[PDB]
Design a protein around this nucleic acid. Sequence first.
DNA 1: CCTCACTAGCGCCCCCTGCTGGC
DNA 2: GCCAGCAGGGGGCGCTAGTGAGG
Length: 170
Amino acid sequence: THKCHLCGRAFRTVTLLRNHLNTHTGTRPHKCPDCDMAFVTSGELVRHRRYKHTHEKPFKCSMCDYASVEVSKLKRHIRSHTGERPFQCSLCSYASRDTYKLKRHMRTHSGEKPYECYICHARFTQSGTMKMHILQKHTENVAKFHCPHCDTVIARKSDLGVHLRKQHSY
DNA sequence: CCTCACTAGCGCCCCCTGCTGGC
DNA sequence: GCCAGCAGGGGGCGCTAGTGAGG
Ligand SMILES: [Zn+2]
Ligand SMILES: [Zn+2]
Ligand SMILES: [Zn+2]
Ligand SMILES: [Zn+2]
Ligand SMILES: [Zn+2]
Ligand SMILES: [Zn+2]
């Protein structure tokens, strides 16, 4: 009906094509009055003000005081209350509570390592791992833990925990 | 018919927390 | 003990199909 002169994508109304072309290029007309961001549509600008400026969180959790801006988050929050596991893995028996978390799990079966350190060019599976690598291996005078019993230095908190559970038996 | 708003809904990515197990 | 893999509970954005309201 209304195709895109850049890709084969098609839409039914003109406003959709107008927004689709406003994504191929940076032409975000809905500008935020309280910060320096902009968006192609209004709905994208609405929530940006409710995330950062007005903190308007409509979706409430009936079990706790949690509140989310989008319903997608609450549906995910409530899963940890009921233990749901809707997203099943196709290659193993792991199930998730968030479609993107399942995408991260697949890096176990594929061996993919997208993130690499910008200093030593060492690669990792998760963006948090890399951030830790830079802290422990490329930062100067980093604070380190200390066992108050045996007087041994440990750099990571988790290592101190397992030190107490193994050597000192909690 | 045609706009333009509002609402659900998928997707993307990152954070921080905390553990495991090879070296 | 160091190191990287790896799962939980979260925040903020990219983009679009569905509904009506008013030209
Ligand atoms: Zn296109
Ligand atoms: Zn803003
Ligand atoms: Zn809750
Ligand atoms: Zn799997
Ligand atoms: Zn490095
Ligand atoms: Zn000790």
